[PDB]
Amino acid sequence: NPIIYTTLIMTVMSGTMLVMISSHWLLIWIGFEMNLLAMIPVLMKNFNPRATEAATKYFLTQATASMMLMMAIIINLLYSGQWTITKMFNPVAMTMMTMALAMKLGLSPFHFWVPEVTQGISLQAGLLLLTWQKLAPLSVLCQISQSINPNLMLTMAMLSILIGGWGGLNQTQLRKIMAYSSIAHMGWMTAVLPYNTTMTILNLLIYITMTLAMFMLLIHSSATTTLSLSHTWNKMPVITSLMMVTLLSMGGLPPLSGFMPKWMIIQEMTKNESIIMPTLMAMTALLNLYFYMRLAYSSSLTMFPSTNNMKMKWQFEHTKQMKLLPTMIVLSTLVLPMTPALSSLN
Amino acid sequence: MPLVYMNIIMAFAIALAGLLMYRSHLMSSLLCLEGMMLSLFIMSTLIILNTHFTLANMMPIILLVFAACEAALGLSLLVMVSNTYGTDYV
C-alpha cells in the first residue's frame, strides 16, 4: 500500500540526505547502509521470478562494496586516528575507498551488475535507481576529491566510457541500453572529478534531467523492447517525435543542452594540459551516440509496420499525467545559452 | 603496527577472497560476508581499546548492528531464490 511505499522511498531520500549532511565518516557508512535496506524492497514491487534475482544481484554487489568501504575507513583511522572526512592518510586504504565507491557508481570494470539489474525492474524503479542512487557515492567523492590518486580515477573513468560504449551497440530492449548510457556518462562525471568538482556537479545535473526525460517518456508510452517502441509513432506521434530530441541531447550534438557537460569538461582538463585524454574520451563519446541514433531509427524517423490491434487503442487517451515531465524535457535541451549560470554552483 | 593487527587484516583479506571465489549455492556467500563483518568489527574494537578514545567505544556495537542488519535482510532474498529452485547460484 502507498502509505508504506512512500515511507520507504522517503527513507531512501533520508538515507541519502544523511550522506550529504554528516561530516563524520561513520554516519556516511550508515548513510549508505540505511540506503541499501530501503532500496531493495522497492525493487521487489509487482514481484517477478526475474525481479527476485535482479535484487539478488544488486544487494550482493552493494553489500560487498559497503564492506570494502568500511574496511578502508577503519584502516584510515588506524593510521591517523580521525573520523572527519578530509584527506585520507594511507594510500593502501585510499585506493580501496576509491574501489568501494567505484562499485557504488557502477563504474567499469565493476559495472557488470548495472546493465543486468536494470533489466529486472520496472521503469519506475529503474529510473529511480539510475538517478537517486548516483547521488550519494558522488556526494562523498566530491568531499574526497582532495586526495584521489588521479591515475586510478582516470583509468576507471575512461574504461567506463569504452565499456559504456561497446556494450551499448549490441542491445535491443531499451532498459539495458539506458543502463549502458548511464554507465557511460558516469565515466564523464568521474573523469573530471580530480580536476574540478563543480564541473562534475554540473554534468550530474544534466544527466539526471536527461534520464528523467527518457524514463518519463518510456513510462508515457510503456515501450520496452525496441520493436515495442517502434509502434508508437502512430499512437501519440508527439512523444516519439520527442524521444528523438532527447536522444540527441544524450548524444551531445552541440546546439543541444547535453553538449554543455562535455564542452565544459574539455575545458577544465585542458587547463591541466592532459590534452590527449579528452581527445580519446570525446572520440569515444561518438560511439556512445551511435546507438542513440539507431534507436532513433527504430522509432520516430522511420515507421516500423503497425499491428492492426492498435486501432482501438486510438480511441483512448493516455491518463495519469506526470506533471514534472515537460520541464524535464525542456531543461534538458534548450538550456545551452545558459551555461554561465553554472558558476552559481561555484 | 603490531603483528596481531596484520593478522586480523589478513583474516579480512581471506574473508573477502572467500566471498569472491564464490561457488555453488550462495548461502555460503552470506556466511563469508558475515565473517568479513566480524573481522572488521574486531579490527575496530581493538583500536578503540588501544587509544583510549572513549566515545568510539560506542561505534563497534553500532557497526555491528547495521552490518548484522543487512545480513539479516540477505537471508530473506535467499528465501525467495530458494523458493523457486532449492538454491544454487548456478
Binding site: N90 | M1, P2, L3, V4, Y5, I9
Partner: peptide, 15 residues
Amino acid sequence: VEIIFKFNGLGDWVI
C-alpha cells in the same frame, strides 16, 4: 612485514 604495508613485529604487549 614486507607485504602490503609494514607490520612492526614483536609481542603484542608492547603497545
